[PDB]
Structures are given as C-alpha cells and as structure tokens.
Design a protein around this ligand. Sequence first.
Ligand code: CLA
Ligand code: CLA
Ligand code: CLA
Ligand code: CLA
Ligand code: CLA
Ligand code: CLA
Ligand SMILES: CC1=C(/C=C/C(C)=C/C=C/C(C)=C/C=C/C=C(C)/C=C/C=C(C)/C=C/C2=C(C)CCCC2(C)C)C(C)(C)CCC1
Ligand code: SF4
Lengths: 86, 40, 227, 742
Amino acid sequence: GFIGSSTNLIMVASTTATLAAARFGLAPTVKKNTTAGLKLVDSKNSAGVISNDPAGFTIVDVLAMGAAGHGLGVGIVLGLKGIGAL
Amino acid sequence: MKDFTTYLSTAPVIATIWFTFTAGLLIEINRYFPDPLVFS
Amino acid sequence: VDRSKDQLYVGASQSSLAYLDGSLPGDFGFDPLGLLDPVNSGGFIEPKWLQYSEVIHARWAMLGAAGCIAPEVLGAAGLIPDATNIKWFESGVIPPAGSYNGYWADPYTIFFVEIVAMQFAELRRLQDFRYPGSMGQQYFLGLEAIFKGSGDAAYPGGPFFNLFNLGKTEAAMKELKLKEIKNGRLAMLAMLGYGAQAVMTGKGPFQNLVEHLADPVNNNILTNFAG
Amino acid sequence: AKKVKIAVDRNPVETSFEKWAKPGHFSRTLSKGPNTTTWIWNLHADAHDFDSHTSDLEEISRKVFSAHFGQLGIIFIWLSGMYFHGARFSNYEAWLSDPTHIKPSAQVVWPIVGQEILNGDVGGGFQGIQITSGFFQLWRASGITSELQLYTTAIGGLVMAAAMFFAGWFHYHKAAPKLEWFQNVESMLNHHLGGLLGLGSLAWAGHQIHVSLPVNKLLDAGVDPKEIPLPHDLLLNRAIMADLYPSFAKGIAPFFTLNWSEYSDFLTFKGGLNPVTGGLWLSDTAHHHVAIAVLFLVAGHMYRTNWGIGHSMKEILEAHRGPFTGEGHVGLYEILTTSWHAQLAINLALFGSLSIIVAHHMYAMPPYPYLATDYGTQLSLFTHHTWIGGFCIVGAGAHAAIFMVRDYDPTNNYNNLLDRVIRHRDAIISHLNWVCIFLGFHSFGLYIHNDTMSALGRPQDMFSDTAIQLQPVFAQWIQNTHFLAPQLTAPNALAATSLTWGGDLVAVGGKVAMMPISLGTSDFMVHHIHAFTIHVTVLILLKGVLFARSSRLIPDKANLGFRFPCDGPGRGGTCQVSAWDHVFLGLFWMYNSLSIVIFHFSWKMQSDVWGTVTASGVSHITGGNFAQSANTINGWLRDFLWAQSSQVIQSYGSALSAYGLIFLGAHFVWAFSLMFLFSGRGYWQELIESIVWAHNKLKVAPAIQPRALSITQGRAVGVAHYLLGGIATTWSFFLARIISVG
Ligand code: CLA
Ligand code: CLA
Ligand code: CLA
Ligand code: CLA
Ligand code: CLA
Ligand code: CLA
Ligand SMILES: CC1=C(/C=C/C(C)=C/C=C/C(C)=C/C=C/C=C(C)/C=C/C=C(C)/C=C/C2=C(C)CCCC2(C)C)C(C)(C)CCC1
Ligand code: SF4
C-alpha cells in the first residue's frame, strides 16, 4: 500500500511544511517579497488576487508552495534511496 | 492591380523574368539540338 | 475556479474587477490572465469574440457531452441493439481506436456532406458577426426571414432559434443565459473528462462511472496509473 | 507596477501594393528617386536599417517582430525542401538497409549540356550527388523509415511556412503589439525558458521515448525496416512496448510514486558510443532531454510578472555593487530594454560561440547513428558550424559599435561599469596589443624557428617530440582525469562521455568511429596559434567598440557616424577610422583564424583518428604524419595542402568534377576581390568619365548618371568577394578530398 509508506509520508510532510511556513510568515509569499538581506518586506502585486483568508493567503501562494513543497519532497525521497536509507 | 503591375515592371523583376526566359530558351535549344559546335 | 455558485470565484482579482461588471452571463470575476481587458484589445483577443466563442464552445460541448454517453446508457438499458452500443471514440471518428461498419456510406463519403453542410451553417453564422443583419437580406429560398439576428451575435433569437419565445422579460432572459452558460461550462469540463478518461483507462465514460461506484477506493485516477 | 498584458493597435498599416511601386519610400533621402547610380546601392544598403528610417521605438520594434516571421517562414521552406527532396530524389530507403556501404544522396541533376556526369554512382541502384549535410543520420535517429513519412513532414513544413508569413502580415498590418508589450523582458524570459526550451525539450523526449527508442532498437537488431512496427502501433499497443522495454508494463505509476528506478531500461546513463552504430545511445539521449526539460521549466519561474513572487531583473542588477566598480550595473536595464542593437550584440556573441561549441561536441560525441564513420559528414558539420559561429561573433562587434554611436547617451551612464570601461580604454587596448605581439612571436616564431633549423640540417635543434619538447601537460592531465571519471567522480556513469579522453576505439563497418586523441608538441604549437589569432580578432573588434565615439585622433568621431570612409587626408591620413572599418578588418582576421582551425581539425582527424580497421591495427588516411610534419610551415604546404589537393585537381571526368570547377572558380573570385581592396574609387570615377564620353558621342548615355562605388562599398564588395572565394576554395578542397578517400 502506497498510502502511509515512507515515500508518501515525506511528500505530505514536505508539501505541508512549505504551506505552513509560507502561511505563518516563515517563507516569502505573494504579498511579501524578500530583500537582499533575506528579510521579508511588503510587495506590490499587479493582479491583486482577492482572498478571504485573514492573512491574505492567496491561491497563488498555494501553487507557489505546492510546487516548492513537491521539489523539496521529491529530492529527499530520491536522495535517501541514493544513500540506501530508503 | 495597377500598382502591382507597376511593381512587376521594376528593374529587378523584369531582369528575373527576362533572364529566366532567355535562359530557358537557350536550355531548351540545347535539349533538342545537343552539342552544337559548328553551324553546318 | 470556485465550484458551485458564488459572488466571486477563487481566482477573482482586483485587476479583473475593473472591466468585469456583471454585464456578461456567468460573470464571476474569474480572469487571472486578464484576456478580457478592453484596453488595447485587438485581433481575436477582444471581449466580443471571446464571449461569443465561449457560448459556441458551450453549445457544441453540451451536444457532445450528452451524445458521447447516450449510446452507452441506452445500450445498457436495452433500448438500442447491442450492435450500436459503441464507445464514443470507437464510432469511427478515430479509426485507429476503432471504427463501426454499418453506416449507409463510407465515413469519408459522410464527411463530405458534413463539409458542405457546415460550410453553409458556419459561414452564414460568421457573416452575421462581421455584418450584423446581413443574412436577412439576400434571397435564400425565403429563409432569410429568420436570419435577421438580434444585434448580439451569440443570441440570434428570431422565429426559429427562439421557436418558443422563452425569456420574454429581461430578468427571465438573464437567468436563462446564466443557466445556459453554467450547463455549457459544465459540459466543456465533462468532454475534457471523456477525452482524458479514454486515454487513461481505454473504456467508455459510462463504464468508468460504474466501476467507480463498485469499488470507489480501488477504482479512481490514482489506481489507473498502473494496471 | 505596470501589469503584464497583451497590448496591440488595430489596423496600424494598410495592405496595398502602392508602395511596392515606389522604391525608397521607407527613407526620406531616397524617396525622391534616382539621379545617380549611387541611389540604387543606397536602396539595398538601408532597407533593413529600421533604426534610421524612424526615430520611434514602437515603429522599429513592430518591423523587427514581423521581419522575424519572414525569416522563420523562409527556414520552413528550406526545411520543407530538404525533407521533400529526401522523399522524392534520394536513396534513403536503400540507405536504411545498407547504411555502411551506400552513400547518402538527395539531389539529382537533369541531363542537359552533359552535366548528367555529376549524377555519380552512390549505391542502391541510384545516381545522384552525394550529400554531406547528415540528414539521413538525423532521420534514422528520429525513427523515419519510409519516404511517406518524409513527404508528410515536407507538406507540414509548407503549412508552417504559410503560417509564419501570415503571422508576420497579421502582426504588422492587423494587430501590431505596442512598445510596452515588447518591454516585458521578465515575461519573455519566463516563456522562452520554460515554454520554448523547456516544453520543447520535454516534447522531444516524448518522441524519443515513444518513437525513436523502439524503432532504433529494432533497426540495430537487424530487423528489416519495412517489418518494424509503425510509430502509432507502438503508441497504441503497450504490449509491444513492454516486449522491447519491460518498464512500460507498469505504466506511469512509477513516475508518480517516485519509483523512477523502474525506468532504468530506457532512461540510462551509459555514456560512450553505441558499438553497433557508433553513435550515442538514444536511451542516454532521452534521459538527457528529460533532465533538461525539468531544469528549464524550473528556470522559467524565476522572474516576476503579475503575482509578486519572482525576481525583478532591475533589482538584481542594482544590488550587485562593489568597491572597485563605482555605481556598478546601474543603467544596464534601461540600455537593454531600449536598444535593439545592444540586445543583438549580446545574442550574436553567445549564439556564435554556441555554434562553435556545437562543432566540438558533435564530432567528439557523435549523436546520430552512422555519423562518425561518414567522414564527409563529420568534416562538413564541424566546418559548417565553425564558420557560422565566426560570422556571428564578428557581427556582435559590429552591433556593439552601432549601439555605442547611436543608442549611447552619457547622461544615463555616469560612473557605471560601462562608463568606467570607456575611461581606461587606452589601458585595455595597449595591454591587449602587447599580448597579441607576444603571442605572435612565441607561437608563429616557433614555426619559423623549426623551418630554418630544418633547412639548415639541424633537426636536433627544432621544437618537436624528438627534439626540444613542448608537451601540453595541462591538457594531458585533463584528458586523463575525464578518462577516470566513472571510477570515482561520476560513479553511476558506465563509460566516459567521449572516446577522445582515452580507452579503446570503436569501429563500425571496418572504419574507426572514434578513438583516443593524443596531444603532443605539434598540438601544443597549433593551439597557441589559435590563441594568437583569436586574441588579435578581439583586439580589432574591441578597439572599434571602445573608440567608436572618439579617440586621440578624431575627438568627435560619433558625429561622423558609424559608417564613414575617413575624415580626410589631414593629420597624416585618417582612412578607415570608423567603427564599421573595424568590422571590415575584423572579418579578415576571423577568416584567417578559423581557416587554421578547420585545417587543424582536418589534418588531425585524418592523421590520428580516421582510418580503416584491419587485423594488424588501425591504418589512418594520412598515416599519422601530423606529429612529425605539422611543426613546420613547409610541412603544412607539402603534406597538407599540396598532397591532399590531389583529389580535387584530378576530379575532372568524374562525378566529383564539379568540385574541381568550383575550386578554380573560388580561386578566381578571391583574386578578383583584390581589385576592390587594393584600389580606390578616384581612379574608377575618372575611368567612367571617358567611358561615358563614348556613350554621349553615340547618344546612348544613361539618364541615371554612372558613378564609381562609394569608398565604403568598395571595402564591402572587396571583403565579401575575398571571403566567398577563400571559403569556397576550402569547401571544394575538403569535400572532393574527404568524399574521395573518406
Ligand atoms: C513568436 C510567436 C508569436 C507571438 C509571441 C505572438 C504573440 C501574440 N499573438 Mg500571434 N501568432 C503567431 C505567433 C506569435 N504570436 C503565429 C505563428 C500565428 C499564426 C498561426 C499567429 C496568429 C495570431 C492571431 C490570429 C492572434 C495573435 C495574437 C497574439 C497576441 C496574443 C497571443 C496569446 O495570448 O496567445 C495565447 C494562445 C492562445 C489563446 C491559443 C493557444 C492554442 C494555439 C491555437 C496553439 C498553440 C500550440 C502550442 C504552442 C503547441 C502545442 C503542442 C501539441 C499539444 C500539439 C500576441 C501579441 C492575438 C492578438 O492580436 O491579440 C491582441 C490574435 O488575435 N496571433
Ligand atoms: C454533436 C452532436 C452529435 C454528433 C456529431 C453525433 C454523432 C453520432 N452519433 Mg450521436 N447523439 C447526440 C449527439 C451527436 N451524435 C446526442 C445529443 C444524443 C442524445 C439524444 C445522441 C444519441 C445517439 C445515439 C443513441 C446513437 C448516436 C449515434 C451516432 C453516430 C451515428 C449518427 C447517425 O447515424 O445519425 C443518423 C442521422 C440522422 C439522425 C440525421 C438524419 C438526416 C435526414 C436528412 C433528415 C430527414 C428529415 C425528414 C425529411 C423530415 C423529418 C422526419 C421526422 C419527423 C421523422 C455518430 C458517431 C449512433 C451510433 O453511435 O451508432 C454506432 C447511435 O446509436 N448518437
Ligand atoms: C501581399 C501582402 C502584403 C502587402 C500588399 C504589403 C504591403 C506593405 N507592407 Mg507588408 N508584409 C506582408 C505582406 C504584405 N505587405 C507580410 C507577409 C509580412 C511579413 C514578413 C509583412 C511585413 C511588413 C513589414 C515589416 C513592413 C511592411 C511594409 C509594407 C509596405 C511596403 C512594402 C514594400 O515596399 O514591399 C516591397 C518589398 C519586397 C517585394 C521585398 C520582399 C521580401 C520578402 C520577405 C521576400 C524575401 C526573399 C529572399 C530575399 C529570398 C533570397 C534572395 C536570394 C535568392 C537572392 C506596404 C504597405 C513596410 C511599411 O509599412 O513601411 C512603412 C514595413 O515596414 N510589411
Ligand atoms: C510531452 C511528452 C510526452 C507525451 C505527449 C507522452 C504521451 C504518452 N505517454 Mg509518455 N512519457 C514521457 C513523455 C510523454 N509521453 C516521458 C518524459 C516519460 C518518462 C518519464 C514517459 C513515460 C511513459 C510511460 C512509462 C508510458 C507513457 C505513456 C504515454 C501514453 C499514455 C499516457 C497516459 O496514460 O495518459 C493519461 C491521460 C492523459 C495524458 C490525458 C489525455 C487528455 C486528452 C488528450 C484530452 C482530450 C480532450 C478533448 C476535448 C476530447 C476530444 C474531443 C473531440 C474528438 C471532439 C501517451 C501516448 C504510456 C503508454 O501507453 O505508453 C505506450 C506509458 O505506459 N509515457
Ligand atoms: C541576426 C543577425 C543580424 C541582423 C538581424 C542584423 C541586422 C542589421 N545589421 Mg548586422 N551583422 C550581422 C548580423 C545581423 N545584422 C553579422 C553576422 C555581421 C558580420 C558580418 C553583421 C555586420 C553588419 C554591418 C557591418 C552592418 C550591419 C548592419 C545591419 C543593419 C542593416 C542591414 C542591412 O540593411 O542589410 C541590407 C542587406 C544587404 C545589402 C545584403 C547583403 C548581401 C551579402 C553581402 C551577400 C553575401 C553573399 C551571400 C550570402 C552568398 C552568395 C550570394 C550569391 C548571389 C553569389 C541591420 C539592423 C548595417 C548598419 O548600418 O547597421 C546599423 C551595417 O553597417 N551588420
Ligand atoms: C603574412 C602576413 C601578415 C603578417 C606577417 C602580419 C603581421 C602582423 N599583423 Mg597583419 N595583416 C595582414 C597580414 C599580415 N600581418 C593582412 C593581409 C591584413 C589585412 C586584413 C592585416 C591586418 C592587420 C591588422 C588590422 C592587425 C594586424 C596585426 C599584425 C601584428 C600581429 C601581432 C604581432 O606583432 O605579431 C608578431 C609579428 C609577427 C609574427 C611577424 C613575423 C615575425 C617573424 C617571424 C620573427 C621576427 C624576425 C626577426 C626579428 C629577424 C629579423 C631580421 C632582419 C631585421 C634582418 C603583426 C605585426 C595586428 C597588430 O598590430 O597587433 C598588435 C593588428 O591589429 N594585421
Ligand atoms: C487550512 C484550510 C483549508 C485547507 C486547505 C488545504 C488542505 C489545501 C491543500 C493544498 C494542496 C495539497 C496543494 C497542493 C499543490 C501541489 C502542487 C502545485 C504541485 C506541483 C508539482 C509540481 C510543479 C511538480 C513538478 C515536478 C515534476 C512534474 C517532475 C519532477 C520534478 C518536479 C518535482 C519539479 C481550507 C481551504 C479547506 C479552508 C480554510 C483553511
Ligand atoms: S579619400 Fe580615401 S585616401 Fe583620402 S582620406 Fe579618405 S579613405 Fe583615405
């Protein structure tokens, strides 16, 4: 069963972490760009996307961090199999 | 159509048609009278 | 794209609200790429053509969605002979996938009639978009009386295309247009579902539904990646 | 925060033939019509100089965009012709059965004036001209097995050509993008990185995985081409694919479950060359384009367009600011979004350098089946793509100087990187000047040293392997490091990327496809010739760009323009000071430098790589005479030019006799050019005066007054004929030689 396996858990954890990090102001988002010093500052969005989320979390943040989470998860899954851990 | 026929009358277009005609005539003559060296 | 009804969908943006003012049917503010912005529009990317095209896609898709599954449902109920209980992609449209022998003519002979018939239907429809009301003037066997249009290309109206003159009131007509667009948009997704499901599983839309109901967990997109 | 959006103007221009009948309409100067013959040349010279017709950037951009559609449409006609001639006038089908014995041919001549002798005996019961373009090898790799497949591509090529010409007309006369549209550099890079290169690589991987790999797997096994399954049968029937590659039995589940190791059977990392065909494994090539697809798709999400996330290219440039460079990269973003010439200067430079890199990598890692053992194709492709790269680089200098004269504005450039470079140009050119003199003495002087020592009977005093030695120790170290890479630094690679590093030779059909290349004293000497001739070409072109606007000789050179002949005989003489003349001189040196590059390649390959495999060993075409002979100028004259030109001069009476004629004709055009280079229009204008008098005497004088060419056109006509004659001479000499022996 794929569900619950090491591969599935890592991908769910990595995807969840990026969404959690971005939503709670731990990663850059649509409304917060990053300065040269790796600090979050307010940004200007041409197509201001309306969102009812109290923190302004838009659907774009989901796609941005969904792909970022998948990239992180895929690398870990394949990386562990490379060293024999997985 | 008057302007288009004027364009065909420009020097480069006339030369292309004229030499295409001239070359074709010479090529066709040598196709039916191959290897002409003496009038005979 | 927010499912169901709502004032605005998920992708609605402050930029798109500038020109999306609810005038068009099914105007839920969803235009993340801003293709309907009137400013500096041209070519085919303009509000009149894009809105017209969506309705045309909606109406073809609705016929396709109902027609790509009716043979399977009617065949399953025994209302048509089993010889015609054929998957939509095995009718003859894609001979490599499957072809049906038994039509009154070769499928290429039928196609030529389709070309000629659709040339008249589609080019006459186009000429009303380019020159509104122009198809009601030149003699067409007296049929030009019903091709005068109504000023809006996507909604000709008239004695035939509005046979039973439904939506007489302005409020009633708006609701009908909204219902037409939502059913049309739903059918467009259904047709894309038929195409994707055919490749992934190789079976008809009706078969996929029946299998899913049997064992929903063991029959879905995830399990169909491998067989 | 200007939003990224589509912006056009409706019906900007009217489609009429009126202006087709009014030559010169585009320019105010030429619109009045001709009075002298100089007008005719000015019409063609300034036709595509859009930046000088109008000062409106928007109008300039719209012409560039549509002129590019015309270029694309022309390539499709050209590509369509190549595919069509393969279907109708080629022996491709016969070649598939016996690739090692049948010579590719796709051109047939008509039987007129006795030219039918050019239809040589190429094999497969076919007569035609042997081609060196390598199209047969490309078609085999993609999986083409019938002339019907070639025919359909040609028809598709013409439809694309029609679409390209429609697009050009549509986007100029019907819906022309506005200037703000063209200036979305962030958006353009995103689409061109992830969309053009990214999806293009992924789409081609789909073809290779589903068409090329199955077809070529059976072709290598010896299956008759006509009995191979058609590509659509492979696509529709997963059962067939499973037989060739069992991984297909599992579908796409491994891809989504991250069990990517399941696809090891058709996504390989072997390295090396396929022993049966002598070309790269297609399974390796498929994994290459799958990896490249992911890299570019990720690359296409870097720049910010409409949703906050991403980078601003302006912000990146302004943040890179150091202590040694003043303001830094400030002002470059405005330069590179308002000057087409500045963009063209960069793109030509790297596009040309890329074409040269292609030449080196394709010969060393032959990517197509039976490409390596076809020595005519290997020589032609390397030489073709080196010349393309050379011309593009010289153009980069030409359009860097055009920017410097026309688009450069001091107010926007104060104490930035661009400004500071101009302020020590004497330091740059003086140092680069010395480096060229140093490299000329210590590289070409060695050849003169060897030639004199050899003529004096002092071979022990020469620079050679049997005498004073100059070993490329650094290059030899790199060859050994790459040869041992699979053991420690690339563990999962089975073989080295190329057989040039070392190992064992691969032989296909009794001929060597690739074998280790050894670097000795001769290779040391020739390489430092390359560094010399490349550095000189940089000096000429860089000098023109840095001194385009002013110098210590002409303090106001910018006002004179980019293309003028001189500023008169004053100050001792100022002939050829304009930046255009630095391109004119740079073309000669580029031609000089690339000629040695393609002579180096031709002699080294025949001497040390190419040859016939036999029981005793490898016998090379020129028998390994490169090492001992290529260290003197006399060796090149005798062993390379004199000996190998035997084939071309004995071509008369055979199918290769055409190369003999072009060999002479090229020699003629080259010498003809020296008339324009060694003379000046002052003599010719006076000569025409006497000629015009004779016509006046007979009432047959023209209304358009004859004029000798301008000073600049004499230099342009001279260099164009000089290049054509010189390059065509080598072209005939190479093909008649390699086709005859290779
Ligand atoms: C360099 C290529 C290029 C570029 C940058 C543009 C740019 C533009 N074009 Mg032009 N165009 C091009 C080539 C190009 N065109 C060609 C080759 C044609 C002839 C076929 C046209 C015909 C054309 C028309 C008729 C119109 C434009 C319009 C436009 C504008 C909007 C485009 C848009 O939103 O498309 C988004 C794309 C779509 C809506 C269609 C997507 C599907 C298409 C039909 C096929 C794509 C195939 C894909 C690349 C590969 C599929 C692989 C496989 C699955 C088969 C914009 C200024 C419009 C305009 O003026 O707007 C103001 C407009 O009306 N173009
Ligand atoms: C876009 C719409 C569309 C298209 C292109 C198709 C196409 C097809 N359908 Mg599908 N279908 C559709 C919509 C569509 N369908 C819809 C909406 C439904 C649900 C109602 C169905 C239900 C359906 C069934 C149940 C079957 C098909 C079948 C077919 C196939 C054979 C068509 C045929 O023989 O027609 C026959 C032609 C006609 C009906 C038109 C007759 C034209 C003459 C000239 C009219 C003469 C009129 C006369 C003079 C006066 C009126 C007389 C009247 C009052 C009695 C073909 C692939 C068949 C199939 O797959 O067979 C293998 C099949 O069994 N379709
Ligand atoms: C039949 C259609 C048509 C017509 C009537 C016009 C009419 C006009 N165009 Mg338009 N145009 C068209 C199609 C057309 N265009 C197409 C298909 C494109 C896309 C490439 C464009 C792109 C375009 C641009 C970018 C511009 C115009 C401009 C013009 C004006 C002057 C053109 C001129 O003098 O041409 C006479 C020129 C020629 C006959 C040369 C033809 C060149 C083509 C590409 C063939 C190249 C062959 C090639 C060299 C072969 C190798 C040669 C070797 C063997 C020796 C005029 C209003 C100009 C304008 O409005 O300026 C204010 C302008 O700037 N057009
Ligand atoms: C762009 C590249 C590309 C493309 C186009 C394909 C395409 C395909 N691959 Mg391949 N593949 C690729 C890259 C690609 N591959 C790469 C990079 C790898 C390495 C990881 C593989 C590895 C791989 C494997 C291992 C397998 C395939 C398979 C397949 C086939 C079935 C895929 C499937 O199940 O789709 C599922 C569903 C879809 C793709 C969606 C289809 C959506 C349709 C087109 C919508 C149509 C809608 C429309 C409105 C309906 C028509 C209406 C009209 C008639 C009126 C298919 C031909 C399978 C196969 O059969 O191989 C022989 C298979 O086993 N591929
Ligand atoms: C992407 C490539 C590219 C593009 C788009 C341009 C575009 C431009 N260049 Mg640039 N250039 C390029 C590459 C490019 N260049 C390269 C590679 C070089 C190095 C050789 C140069 C060197 C160069 C110079 C020196 C100049 C330009 C100029 C120009 C401008 C006017 C050109 C013109 O009117 O030509 C009109 C076209 C012709 C007169 C036709 C030329 C025909 C050649 C000489 C034929 C050669 C032989 C033939 C190919 C094969 C045999 C033919 C057979 C019949 C015997 C224009 C903006 C000029 C300018 O003023 O810019 C501001 C200018 O002075 N370019
Ligand atoms: C074979 C012909 C030839 C030769 C030998 C040279 C030589 C030179 N050219 Mg010239 N050039 C030529 C053809 C030639 N050119 C042509 C046809 C053109 C027209 C396109 C040009 C256009 C041109 C330009 C535009 C430039 C040069 C440059 C140079 C110099 C390159 C660097 C240097 O100093 O190298 C070292 C010198 C040599 C290799 C010459 C031979 C040295 C011998 C073998 C050894 C010394 C002899 C020894 C002392 C014994 C003497 C005894 C005696 C006194 C009794 C050099 C003086 C570049 C320059 O000046 O760079 C600084 C430069 O910018 N040339
Ligand atoms: C809290 C909350 C909620 C929830 C939510 C959720 C639960 C979400 C989820 C979400 C998700 C869950 C998402 C996801 C996404 C994903 C994505 C977007 C992906 C992507 C991917 C990609 C892009 C990939 C790529 C690739 C490939 C294909 C190959 C290899 C490499 C790579 C990896 C790169 C709600 C709203 C209800 C309500 C309110 C609150
Ligand atoms: S006219 Fe000729 S010789 Fe006199 S300065 Fe000008 S380019 Fe030199």
